[PDB]
Design a binder for this molecule. Sequence first.
Ligand code: SF4
Ligand code: SF4
Ligand code: SF4
Ligand code: SF4
Lengths: 460, 460, 460, 460
Amino acid sequence: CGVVGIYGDSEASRLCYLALHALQHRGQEGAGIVTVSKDKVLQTITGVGLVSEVFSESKLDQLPGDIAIGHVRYSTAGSSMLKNVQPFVAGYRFGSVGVAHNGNLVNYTKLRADLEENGSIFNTSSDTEVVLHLIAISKARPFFMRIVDACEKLQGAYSMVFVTEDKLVAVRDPHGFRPLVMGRRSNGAVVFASETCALDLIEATYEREVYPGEVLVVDKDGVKCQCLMPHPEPKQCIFEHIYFSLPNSIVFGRSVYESRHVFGEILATESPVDCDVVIAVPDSGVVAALGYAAKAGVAFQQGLIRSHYVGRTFIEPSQKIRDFGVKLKLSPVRGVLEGKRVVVVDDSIVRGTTSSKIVRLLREAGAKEVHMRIASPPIIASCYYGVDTPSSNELISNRMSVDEIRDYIGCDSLAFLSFETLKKHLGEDSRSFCYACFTGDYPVKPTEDKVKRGGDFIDD
Amino acid sequence: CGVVGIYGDSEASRLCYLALHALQHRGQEGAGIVTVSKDKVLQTITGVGLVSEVFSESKLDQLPGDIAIGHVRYSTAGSSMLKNVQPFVAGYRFGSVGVAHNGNLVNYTKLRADLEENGSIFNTSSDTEVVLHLIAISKARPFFMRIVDACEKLQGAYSMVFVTEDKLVAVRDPHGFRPLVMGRRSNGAVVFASETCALDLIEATYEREVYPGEVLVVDKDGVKCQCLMPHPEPKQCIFEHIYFSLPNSIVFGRSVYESRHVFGEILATESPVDCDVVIAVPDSGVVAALGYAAKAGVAFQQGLIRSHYVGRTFIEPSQKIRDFGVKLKLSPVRGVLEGKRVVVVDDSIVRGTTSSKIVRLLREAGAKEVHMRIASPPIIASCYYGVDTPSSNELISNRMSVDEIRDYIGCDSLAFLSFETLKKHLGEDSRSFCYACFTGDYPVKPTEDKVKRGGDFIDD
Amino acid sequence: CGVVGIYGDSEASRLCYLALHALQHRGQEGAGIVTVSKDKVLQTITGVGLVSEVFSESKLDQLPGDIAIGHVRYSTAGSSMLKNVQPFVAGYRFGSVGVAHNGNLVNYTKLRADLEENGSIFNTSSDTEVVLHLIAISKARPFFMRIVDACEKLQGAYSMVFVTEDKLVAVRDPHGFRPLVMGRRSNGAVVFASETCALDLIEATYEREVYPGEVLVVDKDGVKCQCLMPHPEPKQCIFEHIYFSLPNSIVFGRSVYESRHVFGEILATESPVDCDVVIAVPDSGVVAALGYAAKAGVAFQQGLIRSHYVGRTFIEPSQKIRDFGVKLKLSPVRGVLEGKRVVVVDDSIVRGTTSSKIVRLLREAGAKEVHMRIASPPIIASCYYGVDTPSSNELISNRMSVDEIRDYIGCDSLAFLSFETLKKHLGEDSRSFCYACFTGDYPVKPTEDKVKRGGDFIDD
Amino acid sequence: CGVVGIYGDSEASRLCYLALHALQHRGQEGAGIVTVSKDKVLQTITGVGLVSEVFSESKLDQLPGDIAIGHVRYSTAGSSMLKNVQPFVAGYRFGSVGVAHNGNLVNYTKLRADLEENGSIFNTSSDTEVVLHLIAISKARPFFMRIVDACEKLQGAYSMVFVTEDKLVAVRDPHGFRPLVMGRRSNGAVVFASETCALDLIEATYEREVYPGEVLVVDKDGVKCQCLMPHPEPKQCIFEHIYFSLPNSIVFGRSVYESRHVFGEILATESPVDCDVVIAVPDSGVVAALGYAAKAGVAFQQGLIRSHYVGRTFIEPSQKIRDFGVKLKLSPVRGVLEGKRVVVVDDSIVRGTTSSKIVRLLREAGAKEVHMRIASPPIIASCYYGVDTPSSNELISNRMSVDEIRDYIGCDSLAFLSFETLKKHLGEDSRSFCYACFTGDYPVKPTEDKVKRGGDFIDD
Ligand code: SF4
Ligand code: SF4
Ligand code: SF4
Ligand code: SF4
């Protein structure tokens, strides 16, 4: 998912909408904005669909004010989602507060059961309602002290933005699992975003990361760090660099473009093969493939073309056209592929069902050989920190060998990025990253049965 | 507002939709349904607008199950409503529960402040969330005992339907302020509705009123009254008969058609005037006007015609046409009015602004005289029991005399229904009705500053 | 169908929209407007659905100008209509012209075949495209002379409004089959409409009928009758008074309210029966029923209530609820009907399927007897003049006797309005009306196989 | 624009929808389909917007049949388009016919004036209605002979597909200005499309080009060439290869991918400059830039990223952010640009306004130098053959020098593709291509004042 906050700008809702648009890749199932009116009321509008499908200019017009947070939401309920109320808003003894969260509370069920034992009710099963509940039972003042009280009980990943009647506060969990960054507009306006690309769009100059364990709060006085909670060696999600963030972004202080380009280079040195063309699975693996092509010394060619007009809800012929889902967004250039030995670069392999479709598509297009190259180590464990992966037995690198996956998807060779060379490339910062999906060893371990943060607002 | 519940029918969502349609007059600002899937999960879909604007056949298809409750909501936020989340659903230690409510908790702010003092948060400012909170902090079992526990702390009006993973329960407050009735379908299906007309549509035979102070619960065993909470002398809302319900309805055991027809008769005996025509303000006052015409001995004529295609949002010429809102739904028949002395019957006068528009419309249409007759006593005090009236100083009968209102709206005579003759017509049951809007004396008095239940899910 | 035209008003599109709304009863399948920009271009927007479903304030904004015509369209394709392009616009040697038509060209197929023989193509099968074709092959000048040339070849009914780059012209066929009336606004604005009620809404004072055979043209000079084409004794459609127009209207110089009230009176004198209540089928037959109740000396009671929220596309339970279409818009008042002998008044009986449903509905509501009274003579022949009736063998008065229809619909008695007493009530003007649907004798007879003017813009 | 036809498939409308989707780049302003029902009626549904915005599964369901043509339209009226009625359908003496056209009739106004002189009317100002008119006045039989008769009067570009009650015919004008290609499905189904990519999607194997001057007709007998009209030396649009078609396409027998890659190579040999990075303006110039990077020997990097979620209607901050239109779809990777000398490749320059925006965007992103390279010769003359270019004085290469454009857009160097080296690369086929937009010399010259085919169905 993705979060956004703006303090001190008369177009807070519009700028929040734009930054949510710039982060749309982080979550397509839902969107929402919460803005503080000049009379200090939290107006919220929230729906299922894309940021543009949820917000019209008519609706942005119903959100006047100087402060706003915004959330963009991923969900395996896909388009069959019934309700979405994130950013979550509530009222309690100290006023009104809304929160937008990106992450996953590992100890959600224990926290919820303990709160339920004293009569708490839950409108949604989302972590952010547990965060608000914890803040509410806190007896400390001011608001940031209650945020501190609440966060000390949370295990897991969280990057959050809170909005109140006159404050905007950003929180990054002590491990720093999830990206959060701060920028400033030409006027005093302060913005937080999940990635720097959202800052770039609305011309908020990137200033710094929000630090792991930090509680930044901006009000009339300005931006002030009012807590650097105790935090160990970091564990920032490596999958942000592998897959989840955009190449223009600078997440965790690194250029995502350079990460993926170097991954491609590593694949080419460490698992070369005679080939005539290097191509990508677009648009993800283009950058990595460029790097592979650079080291391998054979030219990159745009052998597959992503369609501009993909919809994700599309008609299919009655007489079966097999693999229509992919053929509706990937078109092969027969001129580039016919009779050639093709190295096709891609960013990962989880289920393995779509890689098979892509290999078949390339072969039907005239490819003589298809050598697959994955710009990531094999994914063996589930993510417990806020991005949905299937269960551990559904991960094809848990069931099958590398040679077995090679046979299953039907390609001549198959090579993953070596985990050890990844750590070598990171070098000094190799200790600053979570790799649980490649190793199986989690920095924060689940205390009982655990969940993916976003399902649906449908109640058991 | 209006509520509906169905237990024991494989088409629960569809039948709930139809009954909400049959109650659409009770509330046009929002609608919603909650249905229990075969796997015992509470699926809910809820939106702003009419029942047909909120529910498509596609969406009814996402609500399979045997149990469902439904709510249809009134709100002075009109079409500018941002969020509507009623019927309200939540999860707590004993499972999942949804509730639909019609009424008003007089002591909401005290109940909410006391709950806030122990760390409760509130997603909405609606009474029904307070009811769920109270149920949740109850330590009793079973569910109906917690309903009893919660209701003993509520002052005010409430007719509610609760749904859980396998039960449907109906609750009527001890004064019986608000209608609630029960009926049975051909199969075992049990339905509760705010008015009998919803029962009539979906062919659930009317069985009985839910009694004041009753907690009916239907499950696999059947319908069982499991509490008849202590209850004073009833105070059923007389405005259900004056204005709020449909003539086909039998609310509080009486035919609403007969109530309004007799009111018209009373107006004609007790305040006659020489006239040539008796007409109504449609479609509300047609029935009363018929009765007036009968007693007065001059013929009823349909002198105004309501338009079938009223939209409630509508374009207006830029060169202002005066009173375009009424002219867009009421068309006079000049043949019936030209040169005649007209007695025009209507159900009430609150603000008094539209009565003036209607008199002007009749005069422009050729009426020689316009004698206004209101099929209700003068409305002087605000309703504290779940249907929105303006504040007491905004009620024209608080500021002005009967003769003063006559002058302000511009008619030759003006007469209200005598309160004493209303009580005489009720006779034996004259003690069973709330009249606070005609007297000023409330059966349940507000403990502090008090609210109207509808609001908007926009947070202070 | 219904037509509208406005000349000389800067809000021509908005006023056209409003008048089309005021005529919405004439046709619900389509709508459209054509307005002349200040640069003398004919901007047109046209769609399937109601006037409000077709035109948004955003779309009215794309139609600036001083002149506009508008059409509202009936079609047996119902909501399954694929295209609608009426008002029809075209360009030809003398500029650009749009036309909106209400009526039916009896000799359409002959006219179209003769035009096809010289290479004409037809985008639609509508009469109005034939009218434009005929105007175009005319070699006369000015424009009204070409209209005259074209109309002399048309047999049948037509009330039309033409718009050009700077003129608005109204045409009524020599028999005057179809209503057309003219009014003036406060500024110079001149409007034509199918019924006076559309004039009344937008405050254009009714001036006069457009006369049978008249070609009125309004331009910068003003309104001028430039042709009173030869026309015989008129044959104005009696069904406008029986069914098609609104009671507020004055069609053909008569009050439709008085027509229907007198019809009710006639039914009561000429076919009385012992009864306890007189009721109507709402909203059509209320006026007639009032008159019946007046003569019969038993009180009218609103025994059925039309629903305000009828949709015409509505969900129905899977387990069969019989006659759900009617039960979804007509609700009986059991108090008015239980155990009583009911006379129910209605405006016609064509198919006879719905009268049976209504009788059954009344009986289920407790009626002891159901005496049906039809405020119209029996309909035996099809209309050849622009309002769709089923074929002659589908008309129940063609198959069955009066006593046979009585048995088929299941009522105790059944009585139609006597044709001879209808002619007596008309008196002097009894010669001025078409009665072909009651007699079978047509004033203008079809020259070959003939059509209903509106089908679909779907091509054979 | 783009055209599609399918004969002999029970899913003709669905397959037409998919092929129109695969051609969506050819025109975004409108879409439409015409399908022949089993009863031999031409059902058509047609609207403004994208293919997915125009067609729902509900609407495809209303188009059953075995034959269908489809059109996708470009229009400078953009989203402000009022009506789109293409594919055009009509009825005439020999039955019913629909046509979809891509091209431009140079002699439209003369053809239309001559047809107007004999009484023709025109619903639209589109060329395709003139084609239908000409077919209709033909006295020859069969249908293809009338097509031949009509085409002999047309000067200009046209690739058309006609549908009748039982035939599908394809027509390519004698110069072959516009692409049209034929393919076959697994069952007998025959499809025509503007580009091979539409064939590829729905698995119709590419068979051959439709030849310049050809009239192919497919019916029950099969595909038969029934006219190879006299045709000069071809003049196929070079802009199909420069800009208009997709790289997966094989238009005019050549791989568009190879054309653009070679153009990039030519730019690098003939106008080199010291640089550190080669980047493209996505996604258009990626292929050419790849070729440039190959010849120049400096690596390609994806220095700009096109946004996936471009909307073409989009909100903008009220405190103006400059160049928001481009910043909303192109994001620079600062890591790739900061301090580097950038060669940025793009496919053309017409107005020159957006190139300036892009250079500014690159400079703000840290580029030390910006060398622009255009993979096309300078565009000096307007296209008279069916794709909209501004007038000749609006083309920046008409006003300014190459060095002058370099200064105006603000880059260090600027180089266009040499026209002579383009002709050299074409070699044998250099005579088979229209270059009027680079030379000024037209193969077919306008006989009088001339138009762009798209317009809007708004009438003068
Ligand atoms: S388990 Fe994988 S996806 Fe989850 S935080 Fe760790 S590295 Fe990222
Ligand atoms: S105050 Fe009036 S409206 Fe309110 S419950 Fe009492 S009688 Fe009804
Ligand atoms: S046939 Fe009947 S409906 Fe038709 S014009 Fe004559 S009276 Fe009217
Ligand atoms: S003028 Fe240019 S764009 Fe037009 S057809 Fe010729 S080459 Fe193509």
